[PDB]
């Protein structure tokens with residue numbers, strides 16, 4: 001019994017290979033991914049959906065984005081940057097970051113590694129409930145840009161969770177495995193993995209020859225993701241509200257919220273229809289907001305940001321010393337890759353090359369990991 005675990009920044013996912021097929025395991029709540037969140041309350045510690053779904057009530061003691069800290073030193077540029085966005089306290093313990101919370105009435109602190117071991121204990125359990133067996137063997141994946149210390153902190157995290165880590169595998173390599181690209185035979189191939197999520201955006205170029213993988217270059221954008229596509233919708237609709245009602249909803253938090261949630265939803269809908277309607281009663285000062293947006297207007301609100309996703313592509317290709325002619329395969333992972341327009345720019349840019357995108361983009365990392373875990377076991 002061996003699983004693959006995508007230990008994620010925001011969401012984690014676990015997969016098992018059985019009856020010749022990966023099954024992606026739903027959690028106790030029915031969800032096939034699970035927030036990488038840990039909440040400390042007056043009485044208990046919650047993990048997964050229970051934790052995410054009380055953030056508003058208890059933000060000070062709800063820890064998330066631990067992958068951002070795992071295996072890093074306190075004065076790491078990434079630690080210092082992100083801290084300004086987290087409501088829980090990050091503490092400097094003699095060079096290493098720690099997360100300070102109130103737990104069962106007590107001040108408590110946790111290395112990011114411990115917090116990530118909590119998520120993995122939950123993922124382990126998710127598979128044990130599916131399977132009606134104890135699970136211990138896992139393949140766990142990390143980012144291609146993880147240095148030794150971060151890889152080690154991540155293995156140590158699986159070990160504390162009672163896991164036998166068969167292997168630590170880069171996320172893009174896991175995704176290439178899911179499409180059986182390690183099975184192709186003959187000459188070497190260059191493969192680009194385009195991974196666009198909610199905040200993260202990671203591009204990776206790998207070499208594959210005879211099943212044997214090699215990272216060639218990596219490139220990122222900390223400031224491009226789906227949240228940014230939603231912002232442009234909010235701005236568009238807040239200006240629509242003003243043109244029609246001469247009222248400014250921007251100073252009302254709950255109104256802005258109802259509108260963002262709706263946008264975020266209508267976005268997902270535009271990924272597979274050509275228009276989305278939104279009706280929100282009494283959105284602001286008793287004023288109803290019924291509107292609609294087309295795919296076209298959506299893409300247009302975002303045309304510069306879509307195009308902008310091609311720049312980490314060009315950095316990645318130039319560090320890897322390859323013309324974009326010599327890329328054989330493009331693999332799409334991360335939820336934002338579902339946006340048809342983004343798929344279209346990528347197909348045109350890699351005119352005549354194959355886009356692998358048919359496995360659920362939020363599940364491909366865990367899919368290939370699960371595939372490889374069954375092999376190593």
Ligand SMILES: Nc1ncnc2c1ncn2[C@@H]1O[C@H](COP(=O)(O)OP(=O)(O)OP(=O)(O)O)[C@@H](O)[C@H]1O
Nearest residue numbers: 008009010011197198199226268271334335336338
């Ligand atoms: N059908 C869809 N169309 C457009 N965007 C989508 C769709 N489904 C999900 N998304 C977007 O994908 C984004 C998040 O994807 P993902 O689950 O990869 O988050 P993430 O932060 O990358 O997770 P992790 O940090 O664990 O990688 C959200 O911004 C969401 O709106």
